């Protein structure tokens, strides 16, 4: 029996049951299921019958039910002897639910309406390791100060993580377990940290005190400062017994001075976050810096003085004692010029690999200074003024984004310089003098309108990944970029400015000159006319992204000039012609696509016709993507035209008929996506081969199926081929007749 | 009887029958219909039965049938004694159809496959005034040279317009009617114009000879030059008897010299088009210019010398004899600098109002020179390099676009300067010195990232319409633009660059300072956080476009800061909150919308809920647009909440139920759009008032209607309210049951 309404899975056994409009815990869950995800449904009541006979349940996720309060009876879960993880986020719960099972090691009640943390609801959960209560009372929510029963956490002697962020606390609760490794108290309205607060927490590796006495100017959320925008008050001995602290978060605590004695018994401190404070003075002096010879990451972002646009950044000499430092983040300090001598203190630190000066309104940099660091790998200068020479995710970081500064594919080639979002509108015979051996260069969004001519990158000739996106480049010279012999990836996306104008000349001939070029992105360039040379040619190129151009124009029926546009891409395996307004492709142009292709995307066009017989000329073709078109016709003889194709994507088309022996004899086809077409039925001979079907996935959701006895053949087929996954059966719905309408074809 | 499948109309009586998937000329056309539009259907055969009993037909449009050859029997139309205009474009016709009715005054056979123009098909059509045969053989189409039977047009003595463009002709046909006013022979492969060719065409006001011996370098279409890219050869006396010529089109005829004697007997010539020739030398000397004292429009665009980037443009002194000149178009000449003395010859011409220098790669202009013209009104400098100081529509112009240079709403305020698509990335204490009294200023797409501060426009303080779109403006000063006291329209669209960054400050306070500001466009700015002042305020503002911002964030449930964001817009009547990702609007924020509103758009959001009762606080509200959301619920008591609302737009929502007495008692509602929702039926009490319904339009197409006997009530209602137009009944389709599926609810 193919499972329903949940999708079950492989490896422990998962019931994927989220987001399928369920009203109750459905009663047809596989009795062998260990993990049940019921999140994002319309479930409103939970009782002792809800999970009965699912006694092997280890994890239940009920996050985000119902979608626009969850009712949980006392003891509702108390049966499930093996229940370890219970996730009850975003449920509008008024209280901790009563009579939870003592087997719990993980309980998340994030984003509910619980202002009372009691012994009654918690103190018995003696096996709890992770307890999450964040984001119950915050910002301008109408909510109550949170009452924590004295001693409530004391009995929890296995507790390693406790999160109370984004609740109104006022004080650090007394009588916390000495088992704690991670304590989260961000934005809890605590103004004073005493000596007793953390005294017995000798296993703590992480303490987050961010957002208490916040710096409120220009906050993107409702923000309540401490009287007079004063600092957090942290007793001299607050951290004296926290010898195992690796992580300390003091962002937006309105700090003006950092007491070096806070760090005296913290020899392992690794990551220190001091964002959104007032530490310009502390950065320029910085006694505390001497206490941190093992620090790896230091974040001093958004410490700018309101109203101030100083000429220079002022870094203490004491930064030279940060011997382990690997990353320094100095965004939002705000300054006009970076000179060589201003970073002297950083230049001997052996492991300093990332310098982040994002968002400083810097107008000029003496670039030669970067060489003098011992080993930079990521010089991040995005979003400055350099010129020619849930509202908030409770499970994310609130003060910044955690994404890599540089795209990992670009940074993997070596040393990276990101000058994106500046004003280098023209390079510059000497723009890149005195730089290291830059491998990854990001010049996206610099308003560049120059004609590149083959000499502009001559001082950084080993760039291997070049990002030129979102400029205004005038591609009017056949030698552009040819100085970059090692170039492997080139991204020219969103440079439509001159391609748009038919009366200026356009030259893409340089593409052929590269011997190592693997990936070229020409997307969203509105390319519809080229000058003299009408063809793209390269012996190396493996991937071309040609989405968001005008192949409808290039391949217009009355024009032969571009019918070989891609044929000289002799090595190509992956081609993307999406978003090109194509109504049909001339036969001859389709036949002139590279025979090497393994992957072809023509999705989101307006294709009314596809010549399937032309697939014969593409013996390596494995994936064909035709989603989002206006196709009506499937061939009845695919096996005559291909023995390679593994995946065929056809969702969002107008196919109302699957032909007799459609499947036959297409051995290679593993995945067929027919979702969102106009199929009313599927007849017995449509899926039939007497040969061996390797079909493992068939998508059918969003078809207007007629649920009369004519569906019974397909139903029988589903019974007889349990190995062919049909996902989201709850969305494989009857459109007709009216008694059936809305119901899954399976439940009939 | 409500008509079907066509929509009939008012004023002569129109059958709008286009684009509704018809297979035959439908037989249910109103016998009183004078004009029948059957274009864009799937019609494949036309016979003598097709229009029978539609004897009052004056005009038939069969353009673009079938959609992917039309068959017309001999004499098929010969009945229709009153047929004057027959439109048979884009039909893939192999021949002129035989036995057309001699009543024809207008025949269009554009874009067919007709290579033979015969007496047999044409010579009897003695009343023809306009005959269109263009675009039958062209570019790389597989087609034949066109054979014109000698004398074929001679018998057509009422012919005033003849179009043979985009066919292969080789020679001007002999024996053309002397009745001609307009002769179109563009791109006909004629290389020589003799003395006999136009000798007897003394009524001609227009001659188009463009595209014969074309200039082919960088053409955006297949283009065949005359041997050696030679010029068109026009005999000295070719135009000697064309005294009534007003329009002459010689674009792309590869002209290097213009013979002044061509214009000797052309005293009324008004518009002369000399685009895409090689007239740089002729522009600098230009004897022919002396022959043209009545010329109003002169177009010399794209006469650039390939490969050449001269410093200056060189205009003959002879331009000073163009006494009537009103517009001069000099795009694509290509030059580096415009100096005062270079336009001396233009400065005394009293009526010269438009100068177009688009697309010249101009780097600098001495702006003071514009003042010295007698009266410029449109100084068009778009798309240069100024710095801080159907494939082709057969019914359009092929060599340029015909749109206004400047938007008519901007140009209507007075003198216009369009500096769009340049590199004025910073203004400039002296940027606008020595200009006339500029009323309409276009600075769109100049990569501007400055902080405007209230002094930048002080030398052009009477700008009334200001276009700042598609820049990178840093709105970080409360005085920005306040020097512009007369400003009425301000467009700040697509300046999301700094609004996107939460950690920089953002200031929109200046808005309040203007006393005449009527229209403000803040669209696509990703606005989600502002500094200090959270409200937009203006006592004058009548229209705010706030589409493509983040009201979902601004109005987040946990934040009160922005719940009055628009309430200080005390005069507002039109507000656009589309494309703001709204899932719902807090009640209090909706109630704080200006009570003056007459027009409110919240389309293309994700609204799952709408509080209809809040409409009580908006007594002037006439149009509510909620299309493109996820609404399920309509109130049953609209009349309790509004007596003003005239138009309610709800297409593309999820409404499956119309309530009992929905219509009641909403006197004011004229137009209700319920297309593309989930209605299965409409019950009798849903549309029922015993009061007076002023409903004149009801849209229902794209609803999954169940066509059983439960539809009969609505059908009866349709019969009983013929005055309530339901458009596109062919698209008001049955989804169920399967016998009915696909069929219009009306035809059941
Ligand atoms: C103050 O600084 C501290 C120390 O840096 C910082 O601690 C980090 O908090 C976040 C919680 O926001 C933790 O990140 C989570 O870690 C867990 C456990 O490994 C993961 O499950 C989470 O990943 C899931 O969720 C993500 C976001 O939705 C998804 O993108 C992801 O793909 C997963 O689904 C998430 O990474 C992080 O571990 C701690 N750091 C530790 C313990 O070292 C804290 O957030 C800062 N405080 C504030 C208020 O900013
Ligand atoms: C050479 O120059 C000549 C002289 O300027 C130029 O003549 C113009 O040709 C066009 C045909 O392209 C005519 O424009 C049409 O005029 C008719 C009649 O009034 C209108 O019906 C047309 O408007 C409809 O079609 C438009 C385009 O689809 C729609 O936008 C519009 O809204 C209407 O539906 C259209 O305006 C124009 O009248 C003549 N000029 C005259 C007679 O003065 C000629 O095209 C140039 N040749 C080439 C090849 O470029
Ligand atoms: C221009 O096109 C290039 C090449 O297609 C785009 O880069 C590619 O982006 C895709 C994702 O869109 C990357 O693949 C993904 O990466 C991770 C694995 O690392 C995986 O999770 C995903 O399932 C998927 O494989 C791909 O690596 C990346 N390629 C390179 C060379 O960087 C680029 O994004 C396009 N540019 C723009 C502006 O759209
Ligand atoms: C920013 O918003 C302004 C104001 O809404 C936009 O300008 C307006 O554009 C509309 C059309 O989108 C114009 O109305 C139309 O004009 C003609 C009549 O002249 C009519 O045919 C149409 O039915 C409709 O009325 C409106 O006049 C124009 N307003 C002004 C003051 O110019 C502007 O386009 C927006 N900018 C961007 C970049 O989107
Ligand atoms: C080059 O710089 C641009 C701009 O910072 C980067 O674009 C960002 O890319 C990430 C993910 O690729 C997106 O989620 C952000 O939206 C982008 N921001 C903008 C403004 O586009 C780009 O990724 C950087 N490229 C490389 C190779 O590191
Ligand atoms: C200001 O300049 C811009 C760029 O030339 C104009 O934007 C064009 O507007 C027309 C119609 O409004 C569009 O059909 C074109 O697509 C636009 N081009 C681009 C690149 O956006 C704008 O209309 C001009 N504004 C005024 C008021 O004249
Ligand atoms: C109307 C433009 C004619 C041909 C042309 N295209 C370009 C272009 N894309 N960018 C330019 C940037 C600066 C100057 C000219 C162009 C340009 N031109 C004219 C041109 C002049 C000299 C040399 C070249 C080289 N292709 C082209
Ligand atoms: C991290 C930025 C802090 C506040 C700020 N926002 C801006 C901004 N939007 N544009 C600038 C352009 C140039 C220099 C600074 C800013 C800027 N800043 C810092 C700032 C410094 C001095 C004065 C001001 C005036 N609002 C703001
Ligand atoms: C710098 O990094 C390397 C590991 O990559 C490590 O071996 C060395 O100990 C580091 N130096 C310091 C002072 O932390
Ligand atoms: C073709 O692409 C493959 C895969 O990257 C690469 O190894 C090979 O070097 C390329 N061939 C040529 C001729 O460049
Ligand atoms: C498909 O292309 C082949 C070219 O190999 C041709 O024989 C056949 O005519 C094409 N089918 C259609 C419908 O154009
Ligand atoms: C300039 O234009 C006006 C009409 O606006 C007209 O009266 C006058 O005759 C024109 N002058 C010439 C020389 O054509
Ligand atoms: C309000 O708008 C109307 C319509 O433009 C205008 O006449 C009036 O002057 C404006 N009112 C104020 C106070 O500016
Ligand atoms: C609609 O808004 C009014 C506020 O006047 C309120 O009484 C009613 O509760 C609102 N309805 C909903 C469903 O929020």
UniProtKB/Swiss-Prot annotation, chains A, B:
Residues 1-748 are extracellular. Glycans are attached at residues 48, 56, 71, 116, 203, 241, 249, 314, 318, 351, 372, 442, 477, 513, 521, 571, 611, 683. Residues 703-748 form the LRRCT domain. One of its GO terms (cellular component) is external side of plasma membrane. LRR repeats lie at residues 82-103, 104-124, 127-149, 158-179, 180-200, 203-224, 244-265, 268-290, 294-316, 324-345, 351-372, 375-389, 413-434, 437-458, 462-482, 486-508, 516-537, 540-561, 571-592, 596-616, 620-641, 644-665, 668-689. It is found in: Endosome membrane. Keywords: Disease variant, Disulfide bond, Endosome, Glycoprotein, Immunity, Inflammatory response, Innate immunity, Leucine-rich repeat, Membrane, Receptor, Repeat, Signal, Transmembrane, Transmembrane helix, Ubl conjugation. One of its GO terms (molecular function) is RNA binding. It is a single-pass type I membrane protein. Changing residue 334 to A: Increases activation of NF-kappa-B. It is linked to Immunodeficiency 98 with autoinflammation, X-linked: An X-linked disorder characterized by onset of recurrent infections associated with lymphoproliferation and autoinflammation in the first decade of life. Mostly males are affected; carrier females may have mild symptoms. Features include mouth ulcers, fever, poor early growth, hepatosplenomegaly, lymphadenopathy, polyarthritis, and non-infectious enteritis. Belongs to the Toll-like receptor family. This is Toll-like receptor 8. The gene is TLR8.
């Amino acid at each position: 029996s193919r499972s329903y309404p949940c999708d079950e899975k492989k490896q422990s056994v998962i019931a994927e049951c989220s987001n399928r409009r369920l009203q109750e815990v459905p009663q047809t869950v596989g009795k062998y299921v260990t993990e049940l995800d019921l999140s994002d449904n319309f479930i409103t009541h939970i009782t002792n019958e809800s999970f009965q006979g699912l006694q092997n349940l280890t994890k239940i996720n009920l996050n985000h039910n119902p979608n626009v309060g969850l009712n949980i009876t006392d003891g509702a879960f108390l049966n499930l002897k093996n229940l370890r993880e219970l996730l009850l986020e975003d449920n509008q719960l008024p209280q901790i639910p009563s009579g939870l099972p003592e087997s719990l090691t993980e309980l998340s009640l994030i984003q509910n309406n619980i202002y009372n943390i009691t012994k009654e609801g918690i103190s018995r959960l003696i096996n709890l390791k992770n307890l999450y209560l964040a984001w119950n009372c915050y910002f301008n929510k109408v909510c109550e100060k949170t009452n924590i029963e004295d001693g409530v956490f004391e009995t929890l002697t296995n507790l390693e993580l406790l999160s109370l962020s984004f609740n109104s606390l006022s004080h650090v609760p007394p009588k916390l377990p000495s088992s704690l490794r991670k304590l989260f108290l961000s934005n809890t309205q605590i103004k004073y940290i005493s000596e007793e607060d953390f005294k017995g927490l000798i296993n703590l590796t992480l303490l987050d005190l961010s957002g208490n006495c916040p710096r409120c100017f220009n906050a993107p959320f409702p923000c309540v400062p401490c009287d007079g925008g004063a600092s957090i008050n942290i007793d001299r001995f607050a951290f004296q017994n926290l010898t195992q602290l690796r992580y300390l978060n003091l962002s937006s605590t309105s700090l003006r001075k950092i007491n070096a004695a806070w760090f005296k018994n913290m020899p392992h401190l690794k990551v220190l976050d001091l964002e959104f404070n007032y530490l310009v003075g502390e950065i320029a002096s910085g006694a505390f810096l001497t206490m941190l010879p093992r620090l790896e990451i230091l974040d001093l972002s958004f410490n700018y003085i309101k109203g101030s646009y100083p000429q220079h950044i002022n870094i203490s000499r004491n930064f030279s004692k940060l011997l382990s430092l690997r990353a320094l983040h100095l965004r939002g300090y705000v300054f006009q010029e970076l000179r060589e001598d201003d970073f002297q203190p950083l230049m001997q630190l052996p492991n300093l690999s990332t310098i982040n000066l994002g968002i400083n309104f810097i107008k000029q940099i003496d670039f030669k200074l970067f060489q003098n660091f011992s080993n930079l790998e990521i010089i991040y200068l995005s979003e400055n003024r350099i010129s020619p020479l849930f509202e908030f995710d409770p499970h994310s970081n609130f003060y910044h984004f955690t994404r890599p500064l540089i795209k990992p594919q670009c940074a993997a080639y070596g040393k990276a310089l990101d000058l994106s979002l500046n004003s280098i509108f023209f390079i510059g015979p000497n723009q890149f003098e005195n730089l290291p051996d830059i491998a990854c260069l990001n010049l996206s969004a610099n308003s560049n309108a120059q004609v590149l001519s083959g000499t502009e990158f001559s001082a950084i000739p080993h760039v291997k990944y070049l990002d030129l996106t979102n400029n205004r480049l005038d591609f009017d010279n056949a030698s552009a970029l040819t100085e970059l012999s090692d170039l492997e990836v080139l991204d020219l996306s969103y440079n439509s400015h001159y391609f748009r104008i038919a009366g200026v000349t356009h030259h893409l001939e340089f593409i052929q000159n590269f011997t190592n070029l693997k990936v070229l992105n020409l997307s969203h360039n509105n390319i519809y006319t080229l000058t003299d040379k009408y063809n793209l040619e390269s012996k190396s190129l493996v991937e071309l992204v040609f989405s968001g151009n005008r192949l409808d124009i290039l391949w217009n029926d009355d024009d032969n000039r571009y019918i070989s546009i891609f044929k000289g891409l002799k090595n190509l395996t992956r081609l993307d012609l999406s978003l090109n307004r194509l109504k049909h492709i001339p036969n001859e142009a389709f036949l002139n696509l590279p025979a090497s292709l393994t992957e072809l995307h023509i999705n989101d066009n307006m294709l009314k016709f596809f010549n399937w017989t032309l697939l014969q000329q593409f013996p390596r073709l494995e994936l064909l993507d035709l989603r989002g078109n206006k196709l009506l016709f499937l061939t009845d003889s695919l096996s005559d035209f291909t023995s390679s194709l593994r995946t065929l994507l056809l969702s969002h088309n107008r196919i109302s008929h699957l032909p007799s022996g459609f499947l036959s004899e297409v051995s290679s086809l593993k995945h067929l996506d027919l979702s969102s077409n106009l199929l009313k039925t599927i007849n017995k001979s449509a899926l039939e081969t007497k040969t061996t079907t390797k079909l493992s996935m068939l998508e059918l959701h969003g078809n207007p199926f007629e649920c009369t006895c004519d569906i019974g053949d397909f139903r029988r087929w589903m019974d007889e081929h349990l190995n062919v996954k049909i996902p989201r059966l709850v969305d494989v719905i009857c459109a007709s007749p009216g008694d059936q309408r809305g119901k899954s074809i399976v439940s009939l």
